[PDB]
Amino acid sequence: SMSYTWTGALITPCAAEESKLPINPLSNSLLRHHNMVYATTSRSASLRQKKVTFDRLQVLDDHYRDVLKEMKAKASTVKAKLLSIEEACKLTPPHSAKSKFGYGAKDVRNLSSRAVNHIRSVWEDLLEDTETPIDTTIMAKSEVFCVQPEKGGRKPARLIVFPDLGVRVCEKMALYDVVSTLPQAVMGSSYGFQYSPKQRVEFLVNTWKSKKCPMGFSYDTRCFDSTVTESDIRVEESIYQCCDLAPEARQAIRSLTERLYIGGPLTNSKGQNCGYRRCRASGVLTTSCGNTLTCYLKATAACRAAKLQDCTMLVNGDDLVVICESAGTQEDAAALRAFTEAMTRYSAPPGDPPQPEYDLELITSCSSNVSVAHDASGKRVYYLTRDPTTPLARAAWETARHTPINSWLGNIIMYAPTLWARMILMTHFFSILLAQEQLEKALDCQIYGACYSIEPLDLPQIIERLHGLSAFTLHSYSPGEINRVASCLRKLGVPPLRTWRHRARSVRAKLLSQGGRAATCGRYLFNWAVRTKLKLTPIPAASQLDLSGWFVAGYSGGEIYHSLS
């Protein structure tokens, strides 16, 4: 069964695609090697198509089936509520794709008579048609990367697939509660999305220390979505069906599974037939939960085949980390081969093969690795961090162009404690914000496929809740970490880490100068940039935050918008 089949209709853009970074002043202040920062366009989509299109063989064994039965037994404890139309409408992001039926996302959120009526009619249809494949749009995704180690050697665009806005509101009705609460229920400590960065590094470390003589490894899969088989999607459904569901909810899931999730026609932006899909659609609500479930099922089966001892997993969609138990160096390298050849039977061959690590800090996952620093107390605090090449690169983009999602905002949130988000991302953007009278404005950002609307003035307490107060006091960062950031600041052409210190003093003074919530940003965020430190006490607004539904579930192209209605 082919992941995709094509007709020859192109993957068309719906608008004008920008490919290169503008030489903006605000841009160049951050990053001067602007010819290194590109964005993806539909021009590279056929390259991608060649990567994602293959025939997939799949052979399930007793291990797989044991594990599946164990997951279903736990999913049987779940009682999932059916959402009301209004409820699912509220969950729709305001700048989500308009419906081909002359109503939009802002219409849905407003309960526009028209939108609501043909959401209803779509729901009705899901109950009375169990067979007809639902149409989908296929699109080249525009993302900014920095170029790489070879020649100018760029990633092709990712392909997104999504049904109509109406179906997407329906998916939410039938399945939001299921995909929000079943992953934790089935996978427990291993479901990665339940974790704020603090909690995530805490789990990783505690898992590590709990071991004998720990061995760990990431496992990258080649184009995961393309490997998800029709079987995979049906089995996924068999798990959902173990929930207590409402009768309509149950037929809705059964219909969506047959009509949408397992495959269907792909249409371009010109309304032409592009071809057929028989694997995971990136942009349906089940994509994150289903990927996580499927990954954790396959991984856990492959462990037992590989005979790895006392494994623990952290699964985030298709990103898999495994901390387990060394049996000797050559033995370990041999079981890691087995895990792979077993994953390959399950139709999940590896990107570049898994490599046993023996330092926790060496293992990468979710584009991330644990690192160590010290708080003001000299006490060693663990934190999570990554190569800043991509974040800074996109930071360079959102500076020079208006973008719907400001990744930097999310990046300062998730990577509050990191050297590079503190010295560059915080400094850069706050000097901009201050020089533009735009601190009180709220900007949209994503955390785990979920959109929030946040005012940057509330960044210190959001950072304290998630990361701790030490994330304003960290120093003595590790050598290699420091050496990676600096090495990256060269590549991108970013002023080095001593440059950013002065700029910070300047804005920090400009921030204190304003009192109110502004000043507490300057005092807390940029306290690193002085030696006569102010001293830092718990912020009153910290505990009074509603950070519910923040680190509960992942919604990768699930179209979720948790912020205020």
UniProtKB/Swiss-Prot annotation:
It catalyses: RNA(n) + a ribonucleoside 5'-triphosphate = RNA(n+1) + diphosphate. Changing I405V: In strain: Isolate pCV-J4L2S. The N-terminus is phosphorylated by host PRK2/PKN2. It is a single-pass type IV membrane protein. Mg(2+) 2 binds at D220, D318, D319. The modification Phosphoserine is found at S29, S42. This is RNA-directed RNA polymerase. The lineage of its organism: Viruses, Riboviria, Orthornavirae, Kitrinoviricota, Flasuviricetes. The chain holds residues 2420 to 2984 of 3010 of the full protein.
